[PDB]
């Protein structure tokens, strides 16, 4: 019947827990579509994935594909406004993003469910009639350049491009995909290329319906969704473009048995081992590559990491298959190196080949395959409901690899055991097909090459035949054994019935001097999972720099100790997070509830009776020191945020103070610290999930009793439960703190306009104002003025206080950046004065939907509750309360708020700026003094420059703490 539809797939296989409706189909023009109906979703979503990416970039214009991606958002013939798309999403509680990989360009958005069509319509035009406006092209070229600039000093990106540069230079795999001003503007200009036309050509050439996949999720019925999608996408032209292919591997003969010595930016020590392998994608029903990754990358008893770590050569390891593109893949085994490890690379690699030999000797094991198959089946059946935005994006991408009916199960459900495929891949992991790369500062000055796109310094040597020979003769090592049955595999999935006394929010069911227990039995997701969150309060975790280092070292030593045993629980879907905080310790255990008690008990017991291995202590301490120093390699904007934090918090140890005190922590010192840290404590926890009240009280008491029995822990005094305060800036004050980033050649800045203490009133004024300026901020500071790639605005919340912050990373100096933000602020004042009452009411509605958007899974709902507990505000009904209040604000209230707290002449303006200067910038003024279509920046007062943080805080008062919310019950 319907000529617009080539076919409607059969029933889409889903989990019996998934209440969403599904319908797959293929349009006449060849677009693969997956429709999703969720009548309860608050936000609708859509995504389109074109099966063409940077790998198809024309040789003479590197990055064109990524630039085409950016440009599609800047206007279409049907919707000309450069920001019609983003503005429409913003006003309807939506958002959007897009990415470019070697073979894909994925576009997606989410929006209030009531505006799916308006959003989908504007979105569809991207693939029908983009304008590629000449003025937008000239401006947007800077965003792309800015994007590359932040990556230039990033070790991961440098290594990513270096591998590409080190393969066959004729293979498209060697292309630079990001692109920058040089490749997108300069170069083409000095070669008479009209990028506008090149974008038009590329778009007209590859954006063919036959290479597109779409996924839409909304409240509408499947029939309504179908007509909707047929109506907006059946008009995309099918140009029958052949799907790009790359059968010849980028690493050929001359590229194997090669060794690379690389100089990193951060002080890191890594060893990368790569093997070229065939494309294994078509074998998704068996996944031979993952089978070997599961074994080679295994942690736990008898594993490769175990021996490497015992020999004190390695700390972490990653093994498995790495994607390439249609036609080729790689198999990697990457390890980090200890100092000793750096000097034993040859032995480390032999151990790898010894372990691989064991795999060949034992042969493929079906029980291992069965185990993963069972685990994956359980994971699929009980998979958490995804957020619409990420879900549609993911489906659109994988619709290109699997039949419509299997698009949900293909990546989870295993079906075939393939000892033949497994052996075939194992036969590619041999010394004569290996590539080895070492990353270490020790290579500084010894390199003879440079990677052109990032400037990476390295040396390339052939591996001597004898070394290859020694590896080829690897024999069985008695230390290497295959894993044993995974005893953490869950088997009990019953959902306890909802107790009669069940509450909508966490209830306080234990309030003792030793512990405060918040509890809630899951009443909406119904999966066999639970979240056990614990907060251990102790003044000694952050009393001084030395103890902060010990709190950290201790927990890091503990996790390194439990790793081998915890890995099994990990594969079985039971993980935990343990870290030190400025108030003590944080422990989180989540996953299938079945075996959580066992993992938890083990952690606490281990914690309270810990024995530190001296060798592990020196190694982890050396890494921690390196980690503290490496902060200098972080980006300018991250430095700005770090500084503001140190500046506004009553107590905070800098990274310089931490490493200085690090030489003082000795094994003896750490051993004394632990028992002292555990002697006096207070525990506040939230147990949320598939568990009863008595199981919860039981778990809480088991934790206390373990600590009491092994560490003689006693309660902490209530007045000892202290929370840090935020510095109170003076009315009409403006302070500036300036610093320099010595790695990145970009400037960073954070502007913080402190308002007042948090409260229903203060909160909504600030949030409404942020909702109204959000998209305009991006459109003004980035799209129009192109200050940088990183342009951010939003509320800042800390220690119960709040305010508006702006964060920008750019080539332009901080004082200039400041001027533009002040100019923008004026533009927003006028703008708000000029907007209609309905437009105002529209933003209120948008904010409301964002705040009332319901969590789709247990961990997300838990997180919201945990946030109320940690902040000690315990306002569980905050969203309904704050929204009800938000719907009462008038345009006048926001104008008053701005004129009183934000305007340059506001009586209560509390401003602080953090200026981070670029590497190649000696000095720079703190304040500075035409009309190139740029708004007029107001004149600024003279700022008081901060020389010493400690003095700065001493001469200022401290805000009080926010009062709790009354949540009564025994």
């Amino acid at each position: 019947n319907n000529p617009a539809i080539k076919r409607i797939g059969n029933h889409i296989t889903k989990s019996p827990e998934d209440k969403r409706e599904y319908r797959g189909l293929e349009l006449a023009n060849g677009i693969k579509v997956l429709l999703i109906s969720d009548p309860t979703t608050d936000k609708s979503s859509a995504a389109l994935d074109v099966h063409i990416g940077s790998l198809s970039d024309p040789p003479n214009i590197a990055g064109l594909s990524h630039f085409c991606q950016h440009m599609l958002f800047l206007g279409t013939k049907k919707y000309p406004k450069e920001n019609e798309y983003s503005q429409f999403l913003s006003e309807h509680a939506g958002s959007s993003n897009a990415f470019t990989s070697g073979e894909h360009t994925n576009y997606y958005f989410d929006v209030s469910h009531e505006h799916l069509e308006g959003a989908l319509d504007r979105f569809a035009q991207f693939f029908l009639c983009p304008l590629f406006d000449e003025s937008c092209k000239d401006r947007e070229v800077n965003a792309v350049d800015s994007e590359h600039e932040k990556n230039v000093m990033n070790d991961a990106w440098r290594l990513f491009q270096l591998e590409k540069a080190t393969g066959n230079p004729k293979h498209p795999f060697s292309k630079f995909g990001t692109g920058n001003k040089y490749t997108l503007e300069t170069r083409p200009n000095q070669e008479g290329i009209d990028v506008r036309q090149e974008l038009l050509k590329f778009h007209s050439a590859y954006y063919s319906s036959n290479l597109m996949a779409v996924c839409v999720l909304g409240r509408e019925s499947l029939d309504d969704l179908t007509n909707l999608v047929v109506k907006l996408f059946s008009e995309v032209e099918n140009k029958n473009v052949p799907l790009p292919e790359f059968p010849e591997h980028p690493f050929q003969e001359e590229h194997l048995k090669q060794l690379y010595k690389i100089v990193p930016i951060k002080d890191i020590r890594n060893l990368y081992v790569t093997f070229p392998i065939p494309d294994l994608q078509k074998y998704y029903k068996s996944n031979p590559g993952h089978y070997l990754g599961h074994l080679i990358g295994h942690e736990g008893p008898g594993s490769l990491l175990s021996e490497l770590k015992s020999k004190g050569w390695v700390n972490t390891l990653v093994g498995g298959q790495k994607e390439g593109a249609r036609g080729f893949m790689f198999f990697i085994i990457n390890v980090d190196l200890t100092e000793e490890g750096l000097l034993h690379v040859e032995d480390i690699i032999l151990h790898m080949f010894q372990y691989i030999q064991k795999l060949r000797a034992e042969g493929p094991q079906e029980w291992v395959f069965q185990e993963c198959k069972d685990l994956n089946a359980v994971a699929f059946r009980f998979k958490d409901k995804e957020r619409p935005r990420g879900y549609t994006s993911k489906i659109a991408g994988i619709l290109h690899y699997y039949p419509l009916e299997e698009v949900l199960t293909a990546e989870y459900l295993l079906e075939e055991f393939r000892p033949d495929l497994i052996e075939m891949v194992l036969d590619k992991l041999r010394p004569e097909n290996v590539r080895v790369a070492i990353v270490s500062k020790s290579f500084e000055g010894k390199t003879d090459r440079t990677e052109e796109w990032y400037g990476t310094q390295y040396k390339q040597e052939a591996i001597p035949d004898e070394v290859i020979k020694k590896w080829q003769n690897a024999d069985l090592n008695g230390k290497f054994k295959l894993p044993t049955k995974n005893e953490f595999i869950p088997t009990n999935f019953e959902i306890l019935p909802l107790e009669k006394e069940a509450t909508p929010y966490p209830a306080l069911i234990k309030d003792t001097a030793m512990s405060k227990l918040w509890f809630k039995q899951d009443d909406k997701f119904f999966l066999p999972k639970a979240c056990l969150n614990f907060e251990f309060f102790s003044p000694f975790a952050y009393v001084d720099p030395l103890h902060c280092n010990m709190a950290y070292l201790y927990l890091e030593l503990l996790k390194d100790s439990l790793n081998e045993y915890a890995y099994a629980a990990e594969l079985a879907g039971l993980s935990y997070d343990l870290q030190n905080t400025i108030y003590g310790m944080y422990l989180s255990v989540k996953g299938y509830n079945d075996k959580q008690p066992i993992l938890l008990k083990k952690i606490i017991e281990k914690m309270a009776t810990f024995e530190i291995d001296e060798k592990r202590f020196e190694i982890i301490k050396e890494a921690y020191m390196r980690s503290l120093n490496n902060f200098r390699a972080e980006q300018p904007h991250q430095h700005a945020m770090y500084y503001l934090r140190l500046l506004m918090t009553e107590v905070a140890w800098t990274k310089d103070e931490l490493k200085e005190a690090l030489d003082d922590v000795t094994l003896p010192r750490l051993k004394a610290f632990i028992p002292q840290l555990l002697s006096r404590l207070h525990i506040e926890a939230l147990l949320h999930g598939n568990i009863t009240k008595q199981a919860a009280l039981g778990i809480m008491q088991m934790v206390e009793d373990t600590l009491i029995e092994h560490a003689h822990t006693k309660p902490l005094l209530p007045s000892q439960l202290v929370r840090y305060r935020e510095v109170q800036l003076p009315d009409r004050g403006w302070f500036v703190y300036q610093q320099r980033n010595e790695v990145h050649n970009n400037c960073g800045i954070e502007i913080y306009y402190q308002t007042d203490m948090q409260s229903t009133s203060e909160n909504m004024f600030l949030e409404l104002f942020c909702q109204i300026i959000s998209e305009p901020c991006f459109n003004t500071l980035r799209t129009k003025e192109q200050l940088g790639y990183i342009v951010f605005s939003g509320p800042r919340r800390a220690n119960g206080i709040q305010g508006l912050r702006f964060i920008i990373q750019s080539e332009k100096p901080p004082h200039y950046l400041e001027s533009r933000v002040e100019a923008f602020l004026i533009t927003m004042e006028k703008s708000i004065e000029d907007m209609t009452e309905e437009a105002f009411q529209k933003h209120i509605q948008a904010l409301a939907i964002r705040r009332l958007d319901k969590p789709k899974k247990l961990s997300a709902e838990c997180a919201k509750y945990w946030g109320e507990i940690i902040s000690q505000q315990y306002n569980f009904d905050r969203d309904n309360t704050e929204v009800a209040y938000l719907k009462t604000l008038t345009k006048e209230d926001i104008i008053k708020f701005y004129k009183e707290m934000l305007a340059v002449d506001a009586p209560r303006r509390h401003k602080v700026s953090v200026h981070v200067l670029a590497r190649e910038m000696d000095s720079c003024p703190v304040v500075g003094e035409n009309d190139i279509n740029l708004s007029q920046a107001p004149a600024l007062p003279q700022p008081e420059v901060i020389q010493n943080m400690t003095e700065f805080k001493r001469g200022l008062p401290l805000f009080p703490l926010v009062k709790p919310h009354i949540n009564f019950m025994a």
Binding site: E147, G297, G320, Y789, V791, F792
Partner: peptide, 11 residues
């Protein structure tokens, strides 16, 4: 562990 780069439009 077992193995499991794109550029974006937006920070």
């Amino acid at each position: 562990h077992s193995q499991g780069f794109v550029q974006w439009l937006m920070n």
